[PDB]
Design a protein around this ligand. Sequence first.
Ligand SMILES: Nc1ncnc2c1ncn2[C@@H]1O[C@H](COP(=O)(O)OP(=O)(O)NP(=O)(O)O)[C@@H](O)[C@H]1O
Ligand SMILES: Nc1ncnc2c1ncn2[C@@H]1O[C@H](COP(=O)(O)OP(=O)(O)NP(=O)(O)O)[C@@H](O)[C@H]1O
Ligand SMILES: Nc1ncnc2c1ncn2[C@@H]1O[C@H](COP(=O)(O)OP(=O)(O)NP(=O)(O)O)[C@@H](O)[C@H]1O
Ligand SMILES: Cc1ncc(C[n+]2csc(CCOP(=O)(O)OP(=O)(O)O)c2C)c(N)n1
Ligand SMILES: Cc1ncc(C[n+]2csc(CCOP(=O)(O)OP(=O)(O)O)c2C)c(N)n1
Ligand SMILES: [Mg+2]
Ligand SMILES: [Mg+2]
Lengths: 788, 788, 265
Amino acid sequence: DIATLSPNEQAAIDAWWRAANYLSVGQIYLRDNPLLQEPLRPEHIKQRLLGHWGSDPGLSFVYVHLNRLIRRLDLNLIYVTGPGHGAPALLANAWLEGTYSEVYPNCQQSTAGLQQFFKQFSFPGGIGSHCTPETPGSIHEGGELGYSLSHAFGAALDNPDLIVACVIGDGEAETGPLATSWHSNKFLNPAQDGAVLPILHLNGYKIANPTLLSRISHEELRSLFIGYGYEPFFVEGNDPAILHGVMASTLATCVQKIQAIQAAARSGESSDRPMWPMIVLRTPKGWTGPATIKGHVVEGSWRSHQVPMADVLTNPEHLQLLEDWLRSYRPEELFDASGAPVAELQAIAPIGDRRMSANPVTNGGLLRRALTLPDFRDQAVSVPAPGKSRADSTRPLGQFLREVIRHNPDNFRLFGPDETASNRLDAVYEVTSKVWLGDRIPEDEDGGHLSDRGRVMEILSEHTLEGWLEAYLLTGRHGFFATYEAFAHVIDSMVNQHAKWLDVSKREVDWRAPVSSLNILLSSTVWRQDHNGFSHQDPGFIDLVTNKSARVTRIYLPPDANCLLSVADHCLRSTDYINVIVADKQSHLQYLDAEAAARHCAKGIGIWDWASNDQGASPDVVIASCGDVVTLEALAATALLREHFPDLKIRFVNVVDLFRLQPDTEHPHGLSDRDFDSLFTVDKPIIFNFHGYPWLIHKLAYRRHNHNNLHVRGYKEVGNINTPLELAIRNQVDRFNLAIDVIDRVPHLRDRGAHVKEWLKDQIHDHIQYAYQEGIDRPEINQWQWPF
Amino acid sequence: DIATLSPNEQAAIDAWWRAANYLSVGQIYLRDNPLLQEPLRPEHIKQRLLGHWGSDPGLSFVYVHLNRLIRRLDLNLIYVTGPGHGAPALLANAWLEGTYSEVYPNCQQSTAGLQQFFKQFSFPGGIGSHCTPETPGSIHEGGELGYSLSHAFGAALDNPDLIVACVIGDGEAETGPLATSWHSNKFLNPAQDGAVLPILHLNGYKIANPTLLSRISHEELRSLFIGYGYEPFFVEGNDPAILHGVMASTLATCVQKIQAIQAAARSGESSDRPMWPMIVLRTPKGWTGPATIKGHVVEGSWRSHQVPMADVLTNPEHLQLLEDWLRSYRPEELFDASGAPVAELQAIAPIGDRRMSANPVTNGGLLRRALTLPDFRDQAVSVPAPGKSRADSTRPLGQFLREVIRHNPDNFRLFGPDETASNRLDAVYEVTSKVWLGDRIPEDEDGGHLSDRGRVMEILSEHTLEGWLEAYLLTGRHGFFATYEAFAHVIDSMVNQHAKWLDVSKREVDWRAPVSSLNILLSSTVWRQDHNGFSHQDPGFIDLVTNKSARVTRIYLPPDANCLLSVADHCLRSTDYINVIVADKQSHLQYLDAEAAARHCAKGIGIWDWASNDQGASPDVVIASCGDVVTLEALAATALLREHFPDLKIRFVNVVDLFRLQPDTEHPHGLSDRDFDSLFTVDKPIIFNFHGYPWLIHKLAYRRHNHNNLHVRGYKEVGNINTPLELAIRNQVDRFNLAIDVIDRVPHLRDRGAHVKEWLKDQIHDHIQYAYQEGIDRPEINQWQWPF
Amino acid sequence: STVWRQDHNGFSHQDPGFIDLVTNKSARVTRIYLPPDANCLLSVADHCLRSTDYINVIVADKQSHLQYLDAEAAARHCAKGIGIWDWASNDQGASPDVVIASCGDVVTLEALAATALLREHFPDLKIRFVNVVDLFRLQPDTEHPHGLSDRDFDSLFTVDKPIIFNFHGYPWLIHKLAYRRHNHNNLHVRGYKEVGNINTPLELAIRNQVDRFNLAIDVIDRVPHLRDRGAHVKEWLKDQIHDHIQYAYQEGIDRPEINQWQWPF
Ligand SMILES: Nc1ncnc2c1ncn2[C@@H]1O[C@H](COP(=O)(O)OP(=O)(O)NP(=O)(O)O)[C@@H](O)[C@H]1O
Ligand SMILES: Nc1ncnc2c1ncn2[C@@H]1O[C@H](COP(=O)(O)OP(=O)(O)NP(=O)(O)O)[C@@H](O)[C@H]1O
Ligand SMILES: Nc1ncnc2c1ncn2[C@@H]1O[C@H](COP(=O)(O)OP(=O)(O)NP(=O)(O)O)[C@@H](O)[C@H]1O
Ligand SMILES: Cc1ncc(C[n+]2csc(CCOP(=O)(O)OP(=O)(O)O)c2C)c(N)n1
Ligand SMILES: Cc1ncc(C[n+]2csc(CCOP(=O)(O)OP(=O)(O)O)c2C)c(N)n1
Ligand SMILES: [Mg+2]
Ligand SMILES: [Mg+2]
């Protein structure tokens, strides 16, 4: 009897459906007189109309039907909204369920509450027109389109009984990120994870053009969505009397198959990739609004996308049409005198946490358990002498991540775009593998590292991975993203969205608990260009992240493996941040042991006393580095200067936290003027060697008292192919150019260092000539060790 | 069957009782090995013991019995703890009920959760030893004793079905604030408010002395507590087998009488002051711990107050006694292997919001509805000419408060220590009256303004009034406190406690929602000394409040009635602050109309253009005032200077927000250096006339670029009796001394203003001589108006 | 019982604010004494049991503490109310580079420990140690006869060297008392700001920046010929702050060498 729809139940569901639309339209238009007790007047209409209408009925259409199956089958559901402009529909149902009144006591279920509820939407000092963090039961802001689908899969991970109902607009489906995220079914495990129920809201139109997926034939539509690995179900029409029963049956069909798929997998009898059920919903745009405006068809057309009538404040004719639109919902039979929904509506409202707007998963910070972090000092490489030993920088991190996975079998995950092996993090493969539910071959047994139980997820689409991870954190869990720095620009749009979400959730919204940080590891830099990656890779992603703020993003550039461990250990505890860690996978020198590394990362920036020779004296120059390749060149330059200028006093400063350079006025995390003057003196030149665009340092540290003595060398440009030393020579960040820069800046070396400066230019000439002759650097360059 | 206790139920209750004690002792002592699976070793004991034990069993003893009646009679209860050092008992029951795990997912109900639960208590980076805001279901921090009782009555207000079980230690009862707060029964309305169930924990001892209330005879104890208006019930003994049944019966007896009292009152058949039930509980201190230590009796003695054995880390003998103490609870039969309580314990655990640790009343900010504030401009007095008309300053505020009460019949209240009539706020009496359930006489009909339905509360004890209001706010409601400035020092201790509570709730605790502000109106100043109040009243309370922070307290000194309205309207919307408004009740000049007043209070500080004559030019001096009496003298001095020095250019600045003077580095609310330099120039003398101790201005504004030109005149001292002008002359804040101060500071007036300065001193001589001759000031002083 | 050595009893956010309230009355009716050790406490109590028309407020701590002055030296110190400690100083016959002043007993210990740290790492640095018992001596003699003269104040605290004042109370109270002095622009007061819920004695001093390590850092910042030369020591001092906080969060108490610190030299 679950598939069939009772006429009595059909009426109450239809009653809820119209009331949700009525509240949605009231939010768009009304600022006063919520229930039409008195004739509508221009003083009740909002001056500026920013809400969108063409998607609201469809979202409410599915939402009321989703609540039906929760009441019947006791399903645990989440609502993820593709078109973020359909916010009124979600809020209206949130208010109808009673969630919004509990979260916001001002907007009660009354006439006075409705006046506040209607006036707040898309209003200065109110709430936005998208699924902002202020929305109860919202994890995804659909303002930027293409990421709703991935967030459904991310939230589904390690939530076996959860079902995430993600509604997808046809226009959104034309975007690149969402077209590739359909293949996320291959990495979702039916045994341990929940289900995603994709609903294609094929209203037929974008803002102003028809959606191609609508204008592509039905046969090719089913062909496209079986090739994605889904079992597609089609509900088409325009008359709700037929569509109420038809749609209810389809949703009943889908849930049984989802449970049948999960029952088959968890029993172990069918350990294969299943054909997940997906719904294709073709309904008119602006479904229950005006039919035509000014002789142009509006309903079921792109003209209904935002607002069918935007001149209602001007001419009374549309004003009467607006009031006629509102009364078509028959609000008199939907709300009582007080302003609450009628008891028929309250009957079909789910109860407590079973409500999709009050599910604690959406406010994931309440479901967040801190990771049991093993002591990273067990994985710290031994550094008996600083800078005299070489070890692979990322491998200790891989071993540390291995022990985190061991102690957090479900709460932690790894995400990587087919680069985990290249990034040299294979230590995690010793305890787990990579997720794969596609076809398997015996050749995968040797080094495939493929298993459905794996805690590491791999796909070449960087958009898919970022959406997977962001949803995983917002549901109250932990993760770590590792990728090349060359392709970081691909996810720049997605990072902005998540940073937006975190910043609002901290300051504006008070009831949203903190979630875990977004930890990103840019594992291959632009200085050590390996085989893969384009020639002109740029560090520009770092500039984009620092663009957001110091109070939501953190940038770490640890010099060695022990600093990488301390940084990763520190950032696996921080909550409301986007942590971007820039480290290189090549074999590098090691500088700090576990104790010294931990103190260094706690400060974020500090003097290296072994690399300095200014103890108990005023340094003639401060050499600072931020990175690992540039740190090596800065250290090598320091060694050269001390050989040729024994009396020269050099203070070596290494900075790991980029944002420490900002003054404490901008953010509390930054250094004070006294602290900054202690590290970098008030009047001596600073030769800063930065892994990135040099101006980023100037943007951060322009307010310092010694900024006029700050001289930053960083990434400028590249040739087609360069050796590691030649590439550093092109950007003037190599050891020889840095030594020349120190000679130019130190006042008592311009006259005295001329002969050394000529010798340094000779070395630049010799190494370039050798590079063009052999294709690599000289052995003494590759095996350079810290002297002294 | 509710009164009698079943043996099966007695066992489960006793099982819960011991488990709560066991967790309490574990928190005090253990940092590792929560369940005694392995022999106790010194590495499991906490290094420093800061918890208190002598009160923990008593609190848990009542708590388990309170949960009994919640499960039986479905009562809505709150736990308010007198002795705040009994925090472990509350936390243990909070953990047992499951509340703590939901709020804190790290401290789960397992062995691993218990390890975190035990290690956190009284630990660096953990939680405190008192009922801090981090405690679930806590409104009152009992660290400072004497205010638990008043907070019970405050939370009870306008919560008719709530019952607040407040446990009171006998030592606490010796304090002044709690002895007088027993009479709060007379102001609690059984018809509209809930009940308070006072439980006297008469353990017989303080920290080191016997409690007098224990050593006073039982007959005189019952005599004392019937004189307070309570029906006292006595439960005495030391054997829990008898005391379990006896005390269950007594609690059953009390609830029925409380419901009978409420049933009689709400039916209207008995509208008299009832004899509320109160429990006197005499149990040994350190009830279930060691009997004797080193030959000294510990249990049932002051030696058990904090820690019965504090050398357990030193000698193994006490270490074995400690482990013997833990095993007396028989933990093997109380927790399973995993670390959760046994299913017998879970049976008697209340469910959901019926749990006293998860009652949403305690986290009152979730229950907070913003006040429907009428437009204050309806009550604004007309000021056609600034400073040329006189009106009573506080009466418009009384009318505004009247309209707030009208639109907020239950959410708002007034609190005053027998000064509302004196403060001239009688406009509120037009709609409501004052609470009184004592004897009534026909003489009260004329101007008594007494009724049980009143929204204004009056009692001469300032301590109990402050406790009433703080609890009212922390339960999610609104209020306004009006009192003299002379007696503000009385509540200084209480204000510190509430400010402490707010500051932690904002920064540390994340799940506690904001509550309404604490609004205090110091309605009678020290300059206009009326009949009542001692001669040497000081403004020192203002200095005490500014000690706390600019981020939790705000000080407002509005000059006129319209500024008082804007300030009160602004502060009735702010949430997490202690707002202290200093205004005077006397007839004063009016300076700003509704529009100009609102702009002024929005800035908090700004130039008065009508009182200035420096438009389009650099002012020779800046005259600033903060208050209303000192504003009049500053204005009168400005008038004198302009009459005698027509070329002199004076900028008049009035400051309402005191904390705007602090630089923006300390707090965002403060002015920037550019903004401050705009109001007070970078190089001209500032003659600041402050209502308070002059050093407070220097503390706030010492970092400003022009602080070396800041010259503050304020309250120094008083004589026995002075006229308003003579008192200002003694403190050198009158118009004549201010004009002299301007002459001294302006560089081009030292030579040129000598003759005027002599004339000004003549006026000081003349007015003092007239004051000693007549006892009042001259008519031209009392009726001074702004010229020009 | 002071607020720095938080005992079992008492609320977490106890404040020294009562001292500020008393100083609001006058120097001619109230006296505030903060004796550093037991002998100084005896002389103060003996002196105040003879005075007639005053409110004497004596701030002392009950915990086990170091002892600094014997009966003869203690009595001379209380008679002055404020004086140089010659054993804790190393500037005899020379101009001190910095004046370290303390007012209290816990803050005196941290001020002494900071002095010991500075002398170990900067042997050439000359430090004058001043201890304050009578708070109101800091007020100039113009306000009250009991206060020090300008010449007397300049002798203790020089006219041009930085003063690192470690006060048991709100730091602004020192500025209210001694704003008129010729060297007030070089007076840098560290006192009670705020507390956490529960702290170890060293951690609580670290939160308020009155511990030995923060004071040593403050001296490095203020002394003109140490900004360049003391950078490496300042980094080491911050490492000690990091290490002791980490140990505090790990064990719940301070390290044994902190609890059993003695005056070297
Ligand atoms: N004051 C500044 N504000 C912003 N960006 C700056 C500033 N000075 C330099 N830069 C940037 O820093 C990079 C190179 O300049 P800089 O780091 O100052 O090295 P430099 O050797 O000192 N060059 P110059 O300052 O012209 O002598 C470029 O990206 C510049 O745009
Ligand atoms: N720098 C300061 N710090 C603290 N309090 C101060 C300071 N300067 C002045 N005061 C206080 O302010 C009051 C009077 O000083 P002030 O406000 O500067 O006016 P004034 O006429 O300039 N007196 P003066 O500074 O001595 O010439 C007294 O109560 C002083 O204690
Ligand atoms: N002139 C002053 N008048 C009143 N209080 C002051 C003054 N100067 C500093 N303070 C207070 O002293 C405390 C710390 O400042 P201070 O004692 O001068 O040490 P400091 O390290 O020099 N701080 P700063 O002066 O801002 O560089 C704060 O609580 C200030 O409010
Ligand atoms: C890549 C991209 N191009 C354009 C837009 C502008 N935009 C915002 S909402 C929206 C409508 C999405 O179309 P559809 O999925 O059909 O949504 P619905 O019909 O449900 O409104 C568009 C085009 C966008 N957000 N992203
Ligand atoms: C006015 C005051 N004096 C002293 C103290 C110190 N103090 C803190 S807790 C406490 C014990 C309270 O005694 P009692 O009510 O007998 O408590 P219980 O035996 O339940 O611990 C004391 C004296 C205080 N908080 N307030
Ligand atoms: Mg569309
Ligand atoms: Mg007691």
